[PDB]
Amino acid sequence: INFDSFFSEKAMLMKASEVRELLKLVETSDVISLAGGLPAPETFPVETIKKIAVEVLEEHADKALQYGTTKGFTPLRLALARWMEKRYDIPMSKVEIMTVAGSQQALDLIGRVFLNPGDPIVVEAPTYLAAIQAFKYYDPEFISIPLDDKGMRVDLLEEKLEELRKQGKRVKIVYTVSTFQNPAGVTMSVDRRKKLLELANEYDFLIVEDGPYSELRYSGEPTPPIKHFDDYGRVIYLGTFSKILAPGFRIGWVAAHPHLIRKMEIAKQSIDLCTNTFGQAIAWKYVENGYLDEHIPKIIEFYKPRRDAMLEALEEYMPEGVEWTKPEGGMFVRVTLPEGIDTKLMMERAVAKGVAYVPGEAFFVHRDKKNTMRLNFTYVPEETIREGVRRLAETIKEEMKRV
Amino acid sequence: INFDSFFSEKAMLMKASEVRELLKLVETSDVISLAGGLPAPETFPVETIKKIAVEVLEEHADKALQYGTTKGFTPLRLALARWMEKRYDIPMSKVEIMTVAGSQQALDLIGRVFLNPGDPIVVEAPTYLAAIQAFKYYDPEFISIPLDDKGMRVDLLEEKLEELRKQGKRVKIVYTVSTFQNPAGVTMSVDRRKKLLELANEYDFLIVEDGPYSELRYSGEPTPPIKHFDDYGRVIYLGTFSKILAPGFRIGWVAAHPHLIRKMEIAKQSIDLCTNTFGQAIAWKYVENGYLDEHIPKIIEFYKPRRDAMLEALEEYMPEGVEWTKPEGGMFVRVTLPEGIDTKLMMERAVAKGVAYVPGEAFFVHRDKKNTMRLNFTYVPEETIREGVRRLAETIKEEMKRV
Ligand SMILES: *Cc1c(COP(=O)(O)O)cnc(C)c1O
Ligand SMILES: *Cc1c(COP(=O)(O)O)cnc(C)c1O
Secondary structure (H helix, E strand, O other), rough: OHEEEEOOOHHHHHHHHHHHHHHHHOOOOOEEOOOOOOOOOOOHHHHHHHHHHHHHHOOOOHHHHOOOOOOOHHHHHHHHHHHHHHHHHHOOOOEEEEEEEOOHHHHHHHHHOOOOOOOOOEEEEOOOOOHHHHHHHHOOOEEEEEOOOOOOHHHHHHHHHHHHHOOOOOOOOOEEEEOOOOOOOOOHHHHHHHHHHHHHHHHOOEEEEEEOOOEEEOOOOOOOOHHHHHHOEEEEEEOOOOOHHHHHHHEEEEEEEEHHHHHHHHHHHHHHHOOHHHHHHHHHHHHHHOOOHHHHHHHHHHHHHHHHHHHHHHHHHHHOEEEOOOOOEEEEEHHHOOOOOOOOOOOOHHOOOEEEOOHHHHHOOOOOOEEEEEEEEOOOOHHOOOHHHHHHHHHHHHHHHHH | OOHHHHHHHHHHHHHHHHHHHHHHHHHHOOEEEOOOOOOOOHOHHHHHHHHHHHHHHHHHHEEEEOOOOOOOOHHHHHHHHHHHHHHHOOOOOOOEEEEEOOOHHHHHHHHHHHHOOOOEEEEOOOOOOHHHHHHHHOOOOOEEEEEOOOOOOOOHHHHHHHHHHOOOOOEEEEEEEEOOOOOOOOOOHHHHHHHHHOOOOOOOOOOEEEEOOOOEEEOOOOOOOOOOOOOOOOEEEEEEEOOOHHHHOEEEEEEHHHHHHHHHHHHHHHOOOOOOHHHHHHHHHHHOOHHHHHHHHHHHHHHHHHHHHHHHHHHHHHOOOEEEEEOOOOEEEEEEEEOOOOOOOOOHHHOOEEEEEEEEHHHHHOOOOOOEEEEEEEOOHHHHHHHHHHHHHHHHHHHHHHE
C-alpha cells in the first residue's frame, strides 16, 4: 500500500525531523539539559490534587465524568471569571470564558477562526515555537517584530502598521507572550501594553495575549496583563493550568468577547467535543476553594532560587561578548552570542562537553537569526544549573576561536 | 468593534443555530428525552476510578501530571495494543497505537491528514453527526451509501466505486461505524466486512472504522471489528474509553499503520500538544490491571434491559406503518415512519405530548431523508422508556392523520 498517495496537501508539508534530531542530541548520555520547556514536577500540588480528585468523585461524579459542554464546565468557568476579575482587576462586562485542551488548542482555534491564507499576523521575534506551529498550518503572512528589555518594540510595530496601511494591507492579529516570554524571558512594560491597545484601536486589530506565566513573577514590579486595560474586547487572553497546577490536565482557558468565544466554541466542537471534564472539575475546586492562591507563592519560592542560580552562573562563567536577558519570572533566559556564531552548529560541540540548550533559530518564523539560544532553569537544581552553565561557557569560549 | 470582519472564510460558514433549537425543545419542562447520545452515569466505575486515581498519584505522580508525548502515554498504548490483540485477534505486525482527545479528535485529524477540498469520502446514510461535522470542515465530496439490517450496503458501494472509477474519480476514505451504529443501531455483517476489505484493495482506499460500541454487544453473534481482518493497514481503527469507562477523560485511541500514525501525530501536536496525561495514566491501569474486562459485562447487564424495554415498547405501542431497527448492542434505535412524514416538523408536536427524539434529517449529509428519527435507551430506566415510547406512538398516530 502506498500511503503517501492518500495524504492531503498540508499533510505532505508537515514533518518533524528537526525536533527528532534535537531530542536525539539532548537525550545523549551524560548531558545536562537546559533545553527543556517543562515545569518542575516538584511544583505539582499532588496531595492537594489527590484530595480534590477524591472529593470530586465522591460529591460530583456524574458531572465530573459525563460529557461536558464545548464551552466548558460552568462551575470552573465561573470560578475563573471571579479569580481573574479579582487578581488582575479585569473589566468583565464584555468578557466570557471558555475552556480549552490547553492554551495550545486556543492557538489552533485562533488560527481556524481568524486566519485565511495570506492574512497578516504579527508575532514577536523571537516567539513561542508552538504558536508558530499552530498558526503556520493556516498559512498566514507572518510579520515579526523585535523585542528588547521591555518586550515587543511597539514603536517598530506602529511603523510597520503604518507601512502596511499605506500598502492597503491590514493585520488581523497581534500575538504576544507579554510576560516572561517563552523563549526570551522579557516582559512588555505597562506603558507599551497601553500603547499596544491604542494601536489595536487605531489600526483595528485583535490582540492575542498568551499568559502562561502571568502568575509567576519572582521579582521586579508587577505588570498587569494587557487584558486588564481592555474595556472593549480587543484582547483575547489565554490562561493555562499548565504552570500553576500541572500540564497533564490539559486545561487552559480563553477570556474574550462573547462574539469571539461563540465562534471558537463552534470550531472546537468538531475538534474534540469538550475539554476533559474530570480535570475541569478538579481545576474548579483548585481555584474556587483557594488552593491555587495558596500554591502560587510556593511555586515562586521554588523557582526563584533556580532563576537566581542561572543568572549568577552566567555572570560568573560567561566570557565577554556574551549577553543574556534578566527574566523577572517564568522559566526561560535568552543568551546571545557574538554575531557569526551559529548555535545550531555548535550544538554537537555543546553536547560533547555535557550540556544542551535550544538553538534560537527555531523561535524565528524564517529562522534567520542564528547566534541565540534558549536556556531553562525550572527543571534542574541550582548546582546542576551552575555546572551546566560552566560547561556552556567553555563551549562558547572555544566556539569563539573557530572564527 | 466589528468582530465579524476578523472571521476567516470557514468561520463565517460554521454556525450552531439548529443544535441550539433542538436543545431548546428537548429541555422543555415535562419531556421524556430519547434524543440524548450520552452513556448512563450509573455505568461509570466510580469506585474503581477513585482507587486508580489515588494509586496513580501515589506511585506515578510525575508521569501522570507532566506533559506527555503527542503519540501518547506509552504504558497505556502498550496495554491497549495487548488488550486489542487479545480481545479481537488483531494482526499487530503493521499496527501502532496513538491516543487522542476522544475519537472525535481522530476524526478531525483524519480530515486534516487525508482530505483536500473536493476529495471523495464515503459515509453511510445515515451516519454519525459528529463525523459529518469533523469532515465537512475540510470540504470533501460526500458520497453516501445506504444501510440495511446488515449495515452498509457494500454491494451498492461497489457499484458506486465502479461508477466513480469510470469517471476518473477515486475515494480516499470509507468511513463506517461498523458495529451498533450511531444513529441506526445496525451492524455490518462479517461477510460484508471481508468484502469491504477486498474492495479497499481493489479500489485502493483506506477504511476508517469507528468502534465506540465494539465492546457493547448484548445479543446476537459476535462480529469482529473489520480491523481483525486487516493484515496490511487498510483500516484505521478508532476506539474510545467514552462508553466503557467515562466520556469525561476524553481519551480515545487509533490503531493504524505506522505511516499514518506518524502523520496524524505531527498534525495533532499543533492542536493540543498531547492527550491529558492524568486520564491516560488512569486508563492505563484500568486496562492493564483487568478492570476494563471486569466492567464490560456489568455495563452490558445494565444496558441490555433498557435495550429490551425499548424494543418491547415499540412493538407494544407503535401503530402499523412504523418500522425500527433491532440493535443487538450499543445505545441507539432508528425508527422509520411512513413516507411523507417530516419528523423535524413533528418535533414540537412530540414535545407537546411529553417526548423528544432526534429528527433523522441531521444524520444525512444533505439532510434529504425526513421520515426517520434516532431514539436512545441507555440514559433512562425501563419504565420511562415505555412511557416515552407510548407518548411517541400517540404523536405518530396523530401525525399520520395530518396527511
Ligand atoms: C507553557 C506555555 C503555554 C502553555 O501551553 P498549554 O497548551 O496550556 O500547556 C502556552 N504559551 C507559552 C508561551 C508557554 O510557554
Ligand atoms: C460515542 C461515539 C464516539 C465517541 O466519541 P469520543 O470523542 O471518543 O467521546 C465516536 N463515534 C460514534 C459513532 C459514537 O457514537
